[model samples]
Target: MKASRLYTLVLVLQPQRVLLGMKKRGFGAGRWNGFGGKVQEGETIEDGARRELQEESGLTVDALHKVGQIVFEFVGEPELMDVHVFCTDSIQGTPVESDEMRPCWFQLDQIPFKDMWPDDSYWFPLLLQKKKFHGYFKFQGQDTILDYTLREVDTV
Candidate 1:
């Protein structure tokens, strides 16, 4: 049997920078990533994204557009992660650090890809280009992407 969980990831962008969080604990700790988490029982995926951005970065997502979806499978684990990715430039408040994450901003040309998920570099450029995408990644372990596929799509 295989198991799966639904989650969200929000990338907040400005004129030339993207906001990312340094996860302080839990699953993606020590890596730079977008702000989001598992969808709660009564909320929509986008609502969960909004909640997470507020919880982790102190920013309320004023407007967001769904950009992509990624399926991540870890070798030997029955569980898979279904991640809905969203991006937005409209937000309110300055980002403040939470116990779960520390917010940081990076220029488009200077994104800390080495400090992010290995798969990010493979597909993130699509987001910068405003192209919707769908991707699947199989990971051998925490640091090794055993195999993957990504494509530009017409919708999320």
Candidate 2:
């Protein structure tokens, strides 16, 4: 069986904060990152990213650029996620709770990693580098790293 492809966009705003979307779902709990979701019918990848960002973060954005992606072969189920990542210069609005997310912001260097998936610490730094990269992650019990791997997206 193949894995599901999910798209996510990370909006890095100013004042030492990165906007993030917190989902309350099967593996959802405390602290979160990024804003995005599944591709909708007839919607282009950019459109889906835009829609998810607006719906989850309550902000309109422009000049969206592809940052990179993540491949999550999440454990438990025979599932995977080819998450396309994008970044925007900034956003405009006050975040509010939606059915899919609780929008908030966290300082880039001071993210609450303890409250998020263990793999973030590895990849986020690459993201902050302004260069692209790839990552693979597996999660185990709460507050633990099962197994992980990542490499910079090499381009000449």
Clashes of each: 0, 0
Clashing pairs in 2: none
Instruction: Supply candidate 2's per-residue lDDT for 35.
Output: 76
TM-score of 2: 0.82
lDDT tens digits by residue: candidate 2, 9-120: 5555565777777776544556586778777788877788888888877777765777777777655757677778787767666777877778777776777766666777
Q: Model 1, residue 50: displacement in angstroms?
A: 0.5
lDDT of 1: 0.92
C-alpha lDDT of residue 49 in model 1 = 91
Model 1 ranges with Cα > 4 A deviation: none
Point out the worst 10-residue segment of candidate 2 by lDDT: 22-31
Off by over 4 Å in 2: 141-145, 154-156
Worst lDDT window (10 residues) for model 1? Answer: 56-65
Per-residue lDDT tens digits for candidate 1, residues 88-148, read 9987689999999999989998999999999999888999998999999999888999889
